[PDB]
Structure formats: C-alpha cells, structure tokens
Design a binder for this molecule. Structure first.
Ligand SMILES: [Mg+2]
Ligand SMILES: [Mg+2]
Ligand SMILES: [Mg+2]
Ligand SMILES: [Mg+2]
Ligand SMILES: [Mg+2]
Ligand SMILES: [Mg+2]
Ligand SMILES: [Mg+2]
Ligand SMILES: [Mg+2]
Ligand SMILES: [Mg+2]
Ligand SMILES: [Mg+2]
Ligand SMILES: [Mg+2]
Ligand SMILES: [Mg+2]
Ligand SMILES: [Mg+2]
Ligand SMILES: [Mg+2]
Ligand SMILES: [Mg+2]
Ligand SMILES: [Mg+2]
Ligand SMILES: [Mg+2]
Ligand SMILES: [Mg+2]
Ligand SMILES: [Mg+2]
Ligand SMILES: [Mg+2]
Ligand SMILES: [Mg+2]
Ligand SMILES: [Mg+2]
Ligand SMILES: [Mg+2]
Ligand SMILES: [Mg+2]
Lengths: 74, 177, 49, 104, 135, 175
RNA sequence: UCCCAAAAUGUAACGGAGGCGCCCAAAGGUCACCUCAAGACGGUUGGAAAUCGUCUGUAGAGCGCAAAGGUAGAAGGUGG
RNA sequence: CACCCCCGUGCCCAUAGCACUGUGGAACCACCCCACCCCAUGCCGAACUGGGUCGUGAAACACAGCAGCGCCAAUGAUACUCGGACCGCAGGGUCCCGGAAAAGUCGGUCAGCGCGGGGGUU
C-alpha cells in the first residue's frame, strides 16, 4: 500500500495583476472553478480561465468573497 | 351541487364562532391530497399500474407516481423504482371527491365513530387517515382479495389550532368525544 | 470483444469520413447524423460499416 | 419561487452589446414597458397603460406596444432587447413585442 | 488514553499554550512550566496516583488529552520503509497550560496529591489557586 | 488608587510595579500605568463586583469598575487591565460569585457539594449597589439533586441574564 | 487530486493519503421550466429510515467516478 | 429635489437580514372571480395562464416603531514577524527597532444613493 504517488504541478494562479496594461487575448487568471469571476471586457475559457477581449488597464474588483471580478478599462 | 352549500356554511362560520375583520380571513380548504403507498408490496408492474386506474376511477384525474429517491435502506430500496401514488385536487374535481367521501365512504366503515379529535398541526391544517380501501362499491373484493388503503391530507388555512373546529364541524365531519 | 467502438461515417454520395464513434451500450443499431463533405451543404451521414 | 425573473435579468447581461433593456410588468392591468440604459442609472422612454387606454385591460397589449415605439422612435432608439419578466411569451405580453416593432 | 478514529500520522513544532484556562471546574490546579509531550502512560499514572490520595473522593478532571500519534520505527531496520505504526499516543503541553484540577479538598491535602503527581511527570510544574475570570 | 503618570503608546512601563490599563465608556478613554502591588492588593479584596476610584495627578477622581484583566501565561503576573466607566444608574452586566452555606446530605452522609458555575452574570440595575457575593443554602438537597438558576434568589432588583433552568450547584455522588 | 510546499509560481524523500488507462446517441447544442439536504408535529399495512402533508430550511445536498476548487440568478433536477 | 405616497427598474453590494409588531385599501399592488377554446399541468387554472367588477386587506407586499437574534465593530494590551544582536546539550528562549492580527470588551445599525412612470393637497 506504500503510496509513492503524486501529480505534476499545475501552474495555476493570478497571471496579469491590477494596473497592468494588457492586450486582447491575454490570459489574466488561472483557476479551477470561478474564484475570480468573468466581469466586463473579459471572457472565460472552457477551463474557467478568464481572459481579455479588449486592450487597456486592468480590473481590481473584490468585495464579494466568492464574488470577485476582473475587467478592462479602455 | 355543494358549492354554495359550502359557502352558506362558511358565512355562518363567520358569525357564531369569532368576528374576523375579513371574509378572506376565514378558514377555507386549499386542496385534498390522496397518497397511495404501493411500496408496502411493490409489484414489478402488476398491481402498481392498476391502483392508479382505481384511484383515477375515484376522481377523474390521472395519478402521478411519487417515485423513491436514493436513500437505499434495510428493506432493499433502489432509487428509481415507483413507491407511491399521489393525486392532489382542487375545486370542482375536489368537492365531488369530498362530498363522495362524506357521502358513502367515511360513514360506512364497519367500526366508525369519528376520527382523531383536535390534534393535527400547530397550524390549523389537517390530515385524514384511511384504514383500508374495502369501503368502496367501485371495486369487487373477489379479484384482489388483499386490497390496501390510502392516506388523505385536508389542506386548509388557519393561524390557530382551535380554529380547526370548523373545517370538519361545520362541513360534515364527526369527531370523537 | 469491446463495448464502445470506432465507426466510420459515409456521406450520402460524398466521401468525407469523420470517425468519432461512441458507445454500443444503448445505440444498439442506430447511427445517423449530419455534417458537410466537399459539397458545401450539411448532409445525412449513415455511420454503417 | 420567482427565481425566474432574476435569471432573465441576468441572462440578458447589463450591456456587453450596447443594446437597451425593455422591462414589462404584465402582472396586472398596470403594464409599464420601460426602456432602460443600464450603463447609467437612467430610464428613457416608458409607455404605461396606467392612464386608462380606454378600459382595455389585456387588449391594451398592442396599444402600449405602439405607444412605446412612438415614444422611443422620437428619441433615436432603434436597437432593442426585449427583457421579459417572470412572464412567459405567447399572448398578452407577446403582443407588446408584435406592436413595438410594427412601429419602432 | 487512545482515541477512537483518526487519520493516524503527524509531526512536530512548538509555541506557548493557546487555551489553558486556569481554574474552570475545580478549585485547585497544577500547571506545566515547560513544553513537552505527555504520554497516555503518564496521564493515567497521574490519575491512578491521585485517586489513591482521594479515595472515595471524586474531584478530578483531566483537561489534557493524548492526541498525537507518534511512531517508533521497527527495531532491526535501516531507514527505508515509511514509518512504523504508532506506539504510545501523546498530547502536547506548553507552559502555563493547566493540566490538573481538584476541587473540594484542603490545600495541603491537595498540594500533597499534586506533589505525588509531579514526581510522575517529565516536566517541572506549579501548584496554584484562584483570581482571574475570563468572560 | 493614586496614579503618577499615564504613558502614551508603547512606553517603558518599568517592571517597578507598573501595569498598563485603560478605562472607557461612551466618551473619554484614558491611559496606562497603574501599580502591581497596590492594584493586586486591591483587586483581590474588591473582586470585580465593586469599584475603587483612580486618579492621575490633579483633581480628576472618577468612578470605574474592573472588567477584563489580561496576564502572563507561562506566569501568573498581571500585564493589563480594562476598566469600564461607572454611570450611576443604568444597569451593568456585572458578574457575581456563587458561594455556599451549611452542610447538606452528602456533606454529612455521602458525596461532595459542587459549584457547577462559579460566577453568574446577573444584570443588577444598580449604580453603587452591587452584590459582592451570592449565598446559596444547600442543607436540603440529597445525592443526585441540583439547584438550577431559577431558584437562585437575586437581591434587590437584579434580573438574571442566564437561563432559568441551567444548573449552578449540584451535590454529586461519591467517587 | 490533497498535505508536506515555509500566504506568489516552483521544490526532494523506498514521506503521509487517494484515484485513472473510462464513460455519456444523451450525462452533448440550444430553448423553456422546477430547487436540494436534514429535523419537528400528523398521518393507509410503514413506522429509527418507505410515501404524503404542512413549518423550519447560504446549503448542512447534488454534480458518472478521487479529492480539491467552484457552484442558489446553477453547472444541480425535468421536458421540446 | 414644492411636501408626501404608490408601481417599475438600478447602485450598493446584512451598519441594509429575521422575529415581535402597528398602519394601508377600491388611487397603485395583491388575494378571491370563471375558463370549451390561445397556453398549461410527468396528477391538479397551486403555478405558468386567458377572460373580470364587486368582495376583502385577511394572506402577500409597502411603510413606520423597535436593538431580544443576527450583522458591523473600535482604543488598550497582546500573538506573531521583516531587519539587527544574542542564550541554552537540546526541547526551546531572550533583547533592540519598526510592521501588527484573531478573539474579546466600548460601542454601531433594524441602511444609503438614482432614474422613469401613477395618483394626491384642485
Ligand atoms: Mg507498494
Ligand atoms: Mg519548531
Ligand atoms: Mg514555541
Ligand atoms: Mg515565542
Ligand atoms: Mg480561549
Ligand atoms: Mg505555493
Ligand atoms: Mg514561499
Ligand atoms: Mg531538487
Ligand atoms: Mg512523513
Ligand atoms: Mg442550466
Ligand atoms: Mg417597490
Ligand atoms: Mg381612499
Ligand atoms: Mg385561483
Ligand atoms: Mg395585513
Ligand atoms: Mg405578516
Ligand atoms: Mg491597538
Ligand atoms: Mg530575527
Ligand atoms: Mg553549548
Ligand atoms: Mg527596522
Ligand atoms: Mg516589538
Ligand atoms: Mg477584532
Ligand atoms: Mg454587546
Ligand atoms: Mg422595518
Ligand atoms: Mg420618483
């Protein structure tokens, strides 16, 4: 039963951070479910990674615990 | 039929008992519910498709089957199997069943003197229990000799437990001394 | 052996295969869909073989 | 429960589109059928039945629809999104849409 | 002593005691002044000694409880398997945490039972009385 | 309870018998140093069910009640104390010790008396008037019996903030 | 998949736990509609637990399987 | 935004929520009202829903009172800790300098900001 098992690192985390200029198609956070939630200007991939539609300054919205959003300001 | 005879007894129910500000504050009946529980002996499709037919002959409504949910048990209870017939009913389809039960059903139990008095809910809502279905002329005993029963729930408004003494009293239901 | 299988699709007079077959568990003999070969139109795909 | 109306007031997002919202209230004989620029906390061109409509009650459908379309065509409003409410979409409330774009 | 279900393996770290409330329950108490592990062997030894001094008494709580599995490896072997099973459970005990607590006996008759209990325990300890009330 | 100085913020607070504290209510909220010896000689004899007036130098004597002390674990030396400003009228949720009187059965023939709750939190609508103690006569109850808070008599207009039914003393069987 | 892993990512051990080598002609697309555990009183053979009925009910359920995240405006339960 | 009050819909995103509770009535809203048909219930006009007043504000909703429940929550002192320098064989501990919780006590609140429409003092 000696159990030497484990699983390769998943480079999950917040990629682009607050006040970074971004581009269309940049991947802005990696997550399992929706810790951070889509928000305006921002799509969300099939694996729940949200990502930019438009270019510009980035996000910052976090009052709802379990209700936090990313966004893009032209 | 029995509609205004209902409503010519609720209006007197306004008077001799209390003094509500509103005729809409009065006790009144929502729906009559009928729940067969065919899982006491669940046939694989034998009687279970028939008991719906007899209950539907009682009412002119097609019963829905209240199927079991997960909750596997001591007496081997796989989830998806049917376990209980149910028929809720309101208005004209309902008062015919209610007058039919005050009529030839409830009075003609062999051992009968009224049902459990003044003990239903903390709310005024009420519930009748049937001993067996052998109190009908819509079925012949010779065929299904081992006939079962059913369970009725008489739904009603009321805020007070003592305000149940009208849904049965001034409607045609005896209750025990 | 096997349950689920691979199964080729063949166009109503086209060519284009598409070979994404699913279970033999419940589709005991059924296998028809629609998608376009080399003619532009989506057409009927009988997935016999 | 009523969870149905919040699912459609989310299902049509605020504006990821630039369109306009058109919230009805066909729960009475008191329909309001408003037009709302959600980007600003502002409402634009309402079309109440609330002052009569000659005593038509569910028949007012077409009248409140054409009253909305007249109130909004006067202001330069031609992109629509029909925000239902709790309500289905077949008869009384469907006619407000049939009349809103007969003359929008 | 032993607990009923768990997980069954652990580790080791230390800092001073989180919740050691002084005298709930009893009048008098004994209190650790050094960090340690303490064995269910040693807890029950203190129990069995203090019972004798307070024969039909019945004034003894044990606000301390063995909890941590600890795992001596098999006696022959080079390092290599994983861990041994547990032998002997232990509870951690940081200074100022209370461990012992009698009530309803004269000071000296409780102080003597605490002296006997403190010769059975692997740490220096103090005997105390009363004052502070939290909530 | 004379006070020499009231230090601001983290200061020396010499271990020359100096304890930090505050007193606070709706308006004023003052400052630190007290005195280990005079405080603790006074804190024992005045419990928490009674007051003593402190004053920083100058004429500012003012009522206060001890409320929550904070002391050195890994030790027994007090470090900090909280005072609440006395108001002279409105009720205050003062704690009160539960004592005992007499010899019960078990105390004569069997098991011991047990104070299952050492301190109740009666509201006591009393400015200066507080109950320093609360006596509970036990010469009545036998083995297995237990006095609940419903029959814990409360002196001179003082409502109970605890459950009527919660046990407070209980003679308990031997062993 | 989760600790370890030292609040970014990463990180060893014959360290501590547990799964995969598939499934689903619908468990998919969309459109529409329902909202779950659990307990208390009362109820036909069942009565600790079938089934109905009322009241409580950020959730104590469910999500094909392992866990972790996430989820009540649904991904959960149902039809075209 | 002249003052209220009601219907819809937003920002905020329990200091706004629950319970006890009082006001409201054909102006608005709501229940009751009848249904072969549009439409619809894995049974039932309970819901969707399609045709309407009276009747009632009972239920629900709106608005007030309210600090028993929740929710928010200081100051003080801590816990820990960046950097600096040390003690103990070790488990572990200390001193200087800044940063500094959690819980608790004082307390705070039964919200605040819009837009459009309806009827009022006629
Ligand atoms: Mg192995
Ligand atoms: Mg360590
Ligand atoms: Mg330590
Ligand atoms: Mg330390
Ligand atoms: Mg504590
Ligand atoms: Mg990391
Ligand atoms: Mg790190
Ligand atoms: Mg390496
Ligand atoms: Mg290890
Ligand atoms: Mg869905
Ligand atoms: Mg409103
Ligand atoms: Mg009027
Ligand atoms: Mg109706
Ligand atoms: Mg009312
Ligand atoms: Mg109410
Ligand atoms: Mg501070
Ligand atoms: Mg350092
Ligand atoms: Mg050395
Ligand atoms: Mg520094
Ligand atoms: Mg410091
Ligand atoms: Mg805090
Ligand atoms: Mg308080
Ligand atoms: Mg209010
Ligand atoms: Mg306005």
């Amino acid at each position: 039963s000696k159990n030497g098992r484990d699983s390769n690192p998943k480079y999950l985390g917040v990629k682009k951070f607050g006040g970074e200029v971004v581009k269309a198609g940049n991947i802005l956070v990696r997550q399992r479910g929706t810790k951070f939630k889509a928000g305006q200007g921002v799509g969300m991939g099939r694996d729940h990674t949200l990502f930019a539609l438009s270019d510009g300054k980035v996000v910052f919205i976090n009052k709802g615990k379990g209700a936090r959003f990313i966004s893009i300001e032209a | 039929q029995l509609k205004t005879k209902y409503n010519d007894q609720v209006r007197p129910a306004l008077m001799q008992q209390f003094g509500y500000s509103s005729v809409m504050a009065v006790p009144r009946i929502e729906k009559i519910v009928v729940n067969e529980g065919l899982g006491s002996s669940k046939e694989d499709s034998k009687a279970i498709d028939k008991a719906a037919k007899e209950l539907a002959l009682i009412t002119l409504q097609k019963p829905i089957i209240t199927k079991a949910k997960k909750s596997i048990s001591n007496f081997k209870l796989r989830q998806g199997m049917p376990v209980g017939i149910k028929v809720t009913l309101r208005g004209e389809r309902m008062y015919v069943f209610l007058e039919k039960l005050i009529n030839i059903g409830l009075p003609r139990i062999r051992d009968f003197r009224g049902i459990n008095p003044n003990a239903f809910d903390g709310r005024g809502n009420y519930n009748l229990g049937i001993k067996e279905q052998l109190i009908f002329p819509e079925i012949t005993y010779d065929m299904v000799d081992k006939t079962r029963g059913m369970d009725i729930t008489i739904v009603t408004t009321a805020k007070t437990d003592e305000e149940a003494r009208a849904l049965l009293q001034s409607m045609g239901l005896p209750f025990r001394k | 052996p096997r349950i689920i299988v691979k199964m080729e699709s063949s166009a109503g007079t086209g060519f284009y295969y598409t070979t994404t077959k699913n279970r033999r568990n419940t589709q005991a003999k059924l296998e028809l869909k629609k998608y376009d070969p080399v003619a532009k139109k989506h057409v009927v795909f009988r997935e016999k073989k | 429960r009523r969870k149905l109306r919040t699912r459609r007031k989310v299902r049509t997002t605020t504006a990821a589109s630039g369109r306009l919202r058109l919230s009805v209230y066909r729960s009475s004989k008191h329909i309001y059928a408003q037009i709302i620029d959600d980007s600003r906390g502002q409402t634009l061109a309402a079309a109440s039945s609330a002052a009569l409509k000659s005593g038509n009650k569910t028949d007012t459908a077409a009248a409140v629809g054409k009253a909305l379309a007249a109130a909004a065509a006067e202001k330069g409003i031609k992109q629509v999104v029909f925000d239902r409410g709790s309500y289905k979409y077949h008869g009384r409330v469907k006619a407000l849409a049939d009349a809103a774009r007969e003359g929008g | 002593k032993r607990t009923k279900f768990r997980k069954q393996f652990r580790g080791r770290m230390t800092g001073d005691a989180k919740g050691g409330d002084y005298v709930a329950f009893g009048d008098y108490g004994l209190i650790a002044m050094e960090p340690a592990w303490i064995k269910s062997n040693q807890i029950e030894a203190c129990r069995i000694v203090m019972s004798r001094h307070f024969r039909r008494g019945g004034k003894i709580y044990i606000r301390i409880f063995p909890d941590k599995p600890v795992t001596k490896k098999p006696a022959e072997t080079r390092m290599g398997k994983g861990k041994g099973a547990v032998e002997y459970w232990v509870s951690v005990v940081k200074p100022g945490r209370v461990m012992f607590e009698v009530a309803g006996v004269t000071e000296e008759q409780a102080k003597e039972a605490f002296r006997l209990a403190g010769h059975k325990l692997p740490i220096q300890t103090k005997m105390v009385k009363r004052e502070v009330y939290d909530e | 309870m004379e006070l020499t100085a009231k230090p601001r913020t983290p200061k020396q607070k010499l271990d020359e018998s100096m304890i930090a504290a505050v007193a606070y209510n709706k308006e004023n909220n003052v400052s630190f140093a007290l005195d280990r010896k005079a405080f603790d000689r006074a804190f024992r004899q005045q419990s928490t069910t009674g007051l003593f007036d402190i004053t920083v130098e100058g004429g500012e004597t003012f009522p206060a009640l001890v409320k929550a002390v904070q002391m050195d674990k890994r030790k027994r030396a007090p470090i900090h104390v909280d005072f609440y400003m006395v108001t002279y009228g409105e009720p205050v949720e003062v704690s009160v010790p539960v004592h005992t009187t007499g010899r019960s059965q078990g105390e004569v023939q069997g098991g011991l008396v047990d104070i299952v709750v050492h301190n109740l939190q009666i509201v006591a609508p009393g400015p200066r008037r507080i109950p320093q103690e609360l006596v509970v006569d036990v010469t009545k109850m036998n083995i297995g019996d237990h006095i609940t808070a419903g029959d814990i008599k409360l002196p001179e207009g003082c409502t109970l903030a605890a459950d009527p039914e919660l046990t407070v003393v209980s003679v308990l069987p031997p062993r």
